[PDB]
Write an enzyme that holds these catalytic residues in place. Structure first.
Site, PDB file in Angstrom:
ATOM      1  N   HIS B  65      48.769  49.983  54.295  1.00  0.00           N
ATOM      2  CA  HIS B  65      48.288  51.315  54.628  1.00  0.00           C
ATOM      3  C   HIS B  65      47.879  51.193  56.097  1.00  0.00           C
ATOM      4  O   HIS B  65      47.802  50.084  56.630  1.00  0.00           O
ATOM      5  CB  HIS B  65      47.061  51.686  53.787  1.00  0.00           C
ATOM      6  CG  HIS B  65      47.393  52.255  52.443  1.00  0.00           C
ATOM      7  ND1 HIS B  65      46.438  52.795  51.610  1.00  0.00           N
ATOM      8  CD2 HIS B  65      48.574  52.379  51.790  1.00  0.00           C
ATOM      9  CE1 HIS B  65      47.014  53.228  50.502  1.00  0.00           C
ATOM     10  NE2 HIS B  65      48.309  52.988  50.587  1.00  0.00           N
ATOM     11  N   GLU B  67      45.048  51.336  57.648  1.00  0.00           N
ATOM     12  CA  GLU B  67      43.888  50.477  57.856  1.00  0.00           C
ATOM     13  C   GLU B  67      44.221  49.005  57.650  1.00  0.00           C
ATOM     14  O   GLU B  67      43.780  48.145  58.413  1.00  0.00           O
ATOM     15  CB  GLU B  67      42.750  50.884  56.911  1.00  0.00           C
ATOM     16  CG  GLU B  67      42.211  52.305  57.111  1.00  0.00           C
ATOM     17  CD  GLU B  67      42.960  53.361  56.311  1.00  0.00           C
ATOM     18  OE1 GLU B  67      42.295  54.277  55.782  1.00  0.00           O
ATOM     19  OE2 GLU B  67      44.205  53.290  56.216  1.00  0.00           O
ATOM     20  N   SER B  92      40.458  59.558  55.932  1.00  0.00           N
ATOM     21  CA  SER B  92      39.445  58.910  55.096  1.00  0.00           C
ATOM     22  C   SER B  92      40.125  57.891  54.176  1.00  0.00           C
ATOM     23  O   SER B  92      41.066  58.217  53.450  1.00  0.00           O
ATOM     24  CB  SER B  92      38.684  59.962  54.281  1.00  0.00           C
ATOM     25  OG  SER B  92      37.515  59.406  53.703  1.00  0.00           O
ATOM     26  N   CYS B  94      41.261  55.066  51.294  1.00  0.00           N
ATOM     27  CA  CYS B  94      41.414  55.017  49.844  1.00  0.00           C
ATOM     28  C   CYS B  94      40.506  53.889  49.375  1.00  0.00           C
ATOM     29  O   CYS B  94      39.830  53.257  50.189  1.00  0.00           O
ATOM     30  CB  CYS B  94      42.865  54.702  49.455  1.00  0.00           C
ATOM     31  SG  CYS B  94      43.402  52.984  49.761  1.00  0.00           S
ATOM     32  N   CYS B  97      41.502  50.362  51.184  1.00  0.00           N
ATOM     33  CA  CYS B  97      41.114  50.224  52.581  1.00  0.00           C
ATOM     34  C   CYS B  97      39.593  50.196  52.701  1.00  0.00           C
ATOM     35  O   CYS B  97      39.041  49.522  53.573  1.00  0.00           O
ATOM     36  CB  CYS B  97      41.726  51.361  53.396  1.00  0.00           C
ATOM     37  SG  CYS B  97      43.537  51.235  53.397  1.00  0.00           S
TER      38      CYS B  97
HETATM   39 ZN   LIG Z   1      44.268  52.854  51.948  1.00  0.00          ZN
HETATM   40 ZN   LIG Z   2      44.788  55.667  53.472  1.00  0.00          ZN
END
Ligand SMILES: [Zn+2]
Ligand SMILES: [Zn+2]
Ligand SMILES: [Ca+2]
Ligand SMILES: [Zn+2]
Ligand SMILES: [Zn+2]
EC number: 3.5.4.1
Lengths: 156, 161
Positions: B65, B67, B92, B94, B97
């Site tokens: 992802h 991040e 924002s 998940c 992350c």
């Molecule tokens: Zn994530």
């Molecule tokens: Zn994400």
């Protein structure tokens, strides 16, 4: 399954342990795992920590396992079990939660345990701790000889 | 998630951090991937330790992802380094992350927006003591909104749905 072990739990932990041994032999952190389909016991993927092998700050055993499964439709994860030789850190716990993997079978939580083990339960996942001595002895050996490398893997 | 929840103060490097995160998101969009980017900045001197974007489509990755990719791009680091950094992300985080930020002990997370997506992670970060700042960056919002509009099924795959 709840309470009673899955028919594939020993297969899963043995594979996770094999991956941890391979990682150890490669000079890396001895943490391995695999993702199995609860439906037929098929192994979707297996892997181990790649911090030293690939200079990776994110490929923990659990993350590497998921990466090795490749891109999958979200529904697939919903009926799988992720096997890990060591209790998941907050990141790996987060991965299990995000994908909705219902079960997490852990080799041991003696050498390491984060708030993630309980958080998984809070989030509705089934957590099983086997207390597999083979995993515990292997991880302990690594921690004994390379404590700083272990600390790096968990940001310590 | 508590009731007496508050945001966070502003940092002198926040403008820089989000600009880089947005740049990474645009790059990902250009590459045909999920437009989510970020970067990690050392609060001690404003140095950019790393930057990255989602690589699901670029590398057939189920874990990269925005991040995660950002952290990967910083390379191996002594644990202490993360303790005084700020992770910037255009969207924002998940649960995964969020977990990465918690594990490494990154004290601060600056988020572009939480309109197009928001997991239990945003609150959990604060529950675990991390400082969270949502800037509501219109550039990020517009970009992500368009992607979700055009590629709904691809967005769902990134969050395992
Ligand atoms: Zn994530
Ligand atoms: Zn994400
Ligand atoms: Ca549309
Ligand atoms: Zn771990
Ligand atoms: Zn982990």
């Amino acid at each position: 399954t709840g309470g009673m072990a899955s028919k594939w739990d020993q297969k899963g932990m043995d594979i996770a342990y094999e991956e941890a041994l391979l990682g150890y032999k490669e000079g890396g952190v001895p943490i391995g795992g695999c993702l199995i389909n609860n439906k037929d016991g098929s192994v979707l993927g297996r892997g181990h920590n790649m911090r030293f092998q690939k200079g990776s700050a994110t490929l923990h055993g659990e993350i590497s396992t998921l990466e090795n499964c490749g891109r999958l439709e979200g529904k697939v994860y919903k009926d799988t079990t992720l096997y890990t030789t060591l209790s998941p850190c907050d990141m790996c716990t987060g991965a299990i939660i995000m994908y909705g993997i219902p079960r997490c079978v852990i080799g041991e939580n003696v050498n390491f345990k984060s708030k993630g083990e309980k958080y998984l339960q809070t989030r509705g996942h089934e957590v099983v701790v086997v207390d597999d001595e083979r995993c515990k002895k292997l991880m302990k050996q690594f921690i004994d000889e390379r404590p700083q490398d272990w600390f790096e893997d968990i940001g310590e």
